[PDB]
Each structure stands twice: as C-alpha cells, then as structure tokens.
Amino acid sequence: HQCVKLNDGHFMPVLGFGTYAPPEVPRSKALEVTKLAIEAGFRHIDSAHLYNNEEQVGLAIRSKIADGSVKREDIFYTSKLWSTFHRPELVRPALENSLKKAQLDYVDLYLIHSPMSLKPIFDIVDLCTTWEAMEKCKDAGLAKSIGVSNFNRRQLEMILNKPGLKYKPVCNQVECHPYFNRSKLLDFCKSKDIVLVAYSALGSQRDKRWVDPNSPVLLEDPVLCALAKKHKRTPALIALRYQLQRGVVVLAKSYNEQRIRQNVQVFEFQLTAEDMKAIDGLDRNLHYFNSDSFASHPNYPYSDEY
C-alpha cells in the first residue's frame, strides 16, 4: 500500500486501477474486473463519464463495501467531466449524473478530462470558468478533491494565476511512460504541489481510433525487458515502479485476472539509480494518442512540447 497527501489535505493511493475498455468488451466485464482489482489490493479506481462504465464500476465498489472487504473511505474513486460539459453551468449536473450512475454520494476526485472543449466539432470556453464551477462542486461535497487532466504547463498556470482562485488542482492526469516521460512537466507540477498521475503508463491499449499501430510497443522495449530479467519481474512492473520512484501516481488498466494481481507487486521491489537512469534514457516524445480529431484543436496540449 501507500498514499500521497494532496494539496487540499486528502490522500490518494499511489497505484490506481484503470477501468477503460473499448466498446467490443461487454460492460459486465468492468464489474468483474473492478471487484478483482479491489480484492488484489487496488484502492484507487479511475473512471469517467466517457468510459460508459460508471454504473458497473460503482456497483463493483458498492458490492465490495457490502461484503465487508472495504469501507467507502478506504476507496479513492475518480470520475471526469467530459469535454462537451465545460460550460460552467453544465459541470455540477454532469457530476451529479456521474454519482447517480455510480450510486455514490461523492467522488474522491473529479477532473476536467481534457482542455479540448467540444460543442454540447470544437468549442471555445474559458476553462477558468469551468474551474470555478469545479470549485463549487468541492464546496458542496460532491467531490472531495478536484483536478485536471491532459493539461500542459501553460494551461495549468492559467488556472493557478486565476484571480480569486480558491482551490488549486490537486493533480494533472496525463499520458506518461518511459517513451514520453514528461520530466519538465513533472518538475513544474512538483514545484506547485500538484501530483502528476500517469495514464497509459503501460503503453496504452493501442486502440485503432487513436493510436498508430506502427508505433513501438512500450512493453517490448529491450531495456524494460533487460530490467525485468535482472529483477525477475515483468516489463509492466518495471514501467509502474519507475513512476513510483519519480514521485508520479501511476494507473494501470488490466481486464486480466492474472495481470491485475501481478500489478500490485509494484510495491514488492525497487529499482536502483542506474536502472532509473536507463529508463530515463528511453524518453522520445512519443505520445500514443495521436489523432487528427484533436491535433488541430485550439487547446491541444502537445503544441507547446517544443
């Protein structure tokens, strides 16, 4: 186990369970694998309105509460505001709908899923107004903590320098792995008392809608394989452990009972400085999400990478 204290005083488990599966996977699987993740030791569960699974995920959590395994307060459940609901008047009802789907009274964490506003086809919205609406959700107790996702440094500073800012984002959940390690952004986050949460920490699910299949497969990397042999673990476990040692909170999606249980072994071993340096050397500006649908968005996060 372990947690990090967020800048609002609440605590977030450093390993999280990724609940996203594509639509060819039946919705009943999300129920089954979330129970298995909880049984394995996961206490941080990551969902979203977009994932069309919140009823299954909440039910998995409610059912592990009902059978005595955990208490509500032992679970860190995250959901996310989808990009068609950035207009400030849409934020609280979107959150209320997510809680009804999950049949929960509050989320531990609510995030702005993306800065790339879409029309309720792109939209123009002052994300600072979105953020104010997020702060009122926290004041109301709908969300214990509030944060952002897919923000670059500039987008984060906009929020941080907002006149009358009441609550800082507790985190920024972003694509992060050995091929796109986000070092500078991570330093910026640490400087501001903001946690970086890694998604696609295992190389993404390589969905054809968003990911070039020609792209290298992170988990076949020769340095990750060589480190997995050295420690007698697996490339996945090397990738997750790398994140914990750099101060990143790391997600891990698996819908496989074996791999779900394996991923919690991240707490059972440690990498050396030289191992960390070798993994650092893999960085190569490779974001797996790489689509026309977003590359030309006015608020695309990766156009400040230069």
Ligand X SMILES: NC(=O)c1ccc[n+]([C@@H]2O[C@H](COP(=O)([O-])OP(=O)(O)OC[C@H]3O[C@@H](n4cnc5c(N)ncnc54)[C@H](OP(=O)(O)O)[C@@H]3O)[C@@H](O)[C@H]2O)c1
Ligand Y SMILES: CNC(=O)c1cccc(S(=O)(=O)N2CCc3ccccc3C2)c1
Bridge partners of residue 110, in order along the sequence: 79, 146
* Residues comprising the chain, all counted: 306
Nearer of residues 31 and 236 to ligand X, judged by Cβ: 236
Angle at 116 between CA 7 and CA 134, to 5 degrees: 40
Residue 19 binding result from ligand Y, ligand X, none, given CB thresholds of 5 to 8 Å by partner type: ligand X
Binding marks (x or -) toward ligand X, 28..67, rule CB under 6 A? ------------------x---------------------
Binding of ligand Y by 288 (CB under 6 A): no
What are the distances in angstroms from CA 301 to CA 92, 119, 172, 245, 306?
A: 25, 18, 12, 25, 11
Nearer of residues 197 and 227 to ligand Y, judged by Cβ: 197
Q: How many CB atoms lie within 10 A of CB 169?
A: 27
Binding of ligand X by 76 (CB under 6 A): no
State how far Cα 295 lies from the chain centre.
Answer: 21
Q: Of all residues in this chain, which one has the CB nearest to ligand X in the complex?
A: 18
Write out the binding residues for NADP(+): 19-20, 46, 149-150, 173, 199-205, 253-255, 259-263
Query: If DSSP states are collapsed to H, E and C, what string results for 65-95?
Result: HHCCCCCHHHCEEEEEECHHHCCHHHHHHHH
- Select the span of 109-117, 164-172, 176-184, 233-241 touching ligand Y (CB under 6 A): 109-117
What are the distances in angstroms from CA 79 to CA 7, 47, 146, 147?
A: 19, 5, 10, 10
The footprint of ligand Y on residues 186-245 (CB under 6 A) is none
Q: Tokens 């409610």 sit at which residue?
A: 62
Residue 294 binding result from ligand X, ligand Y, none, given CB thresholds of 5 to 8 Å by partner type: ligand Y
Binding of ligand X by 18 (CB under 6 A): yes
The footprint of ligand Y on residues 133-162 (CB under 6 A) is 150
Q: How many CB atoms lie within 10 A of CB 24?
A: 5
Is 51 catalytic? The answer is yes
Candidates 20, 110, 131, 242; binder of ligand Y (CB under 6 A) is 20
- Select the span of 89-97, 136-144, 220-228, 246-254 touching ligand X (CB under 6 A): 246-254
Candidates 183, 270, 272, 291; binder of ligand Y (CB under 6 A) is 291
CB 177 within 8 A of CB 201: yes
Size of the site for ligand X (CB under 6 A): 27
Residue 202 binding result from ligand X, ligand Y, none, given CB thresholds of 5 to 8 Å by partner type: ligand X
Calpha distance 242→228 (Å, rounded): 12
The footprint of ligand X on residues 169-228 (CB under 6 A) is 173, 199-205, 219
Size of the site for ligand Y (CB under 6 A): 12
Nearer of residues 164 and 303 to ligand X, judged by Cβ: 303
Nearest to 174 by CA among 304, 25, 266, 86: 304
Binding of ligand Y by 116 (CB under 6 A): yes
Q: Tokens 């999400």 sit at which residue?
A: 289
Nearest to 240 by CA among 221, 263, 212: 263
Report the catalytic residues: 51
In the complex, which residues of this chain contact ligand Y (CB under 6 A)?
Answer: 20, 48, 50, 83, 113-114, 116, 150, 289, 291, 294, 302
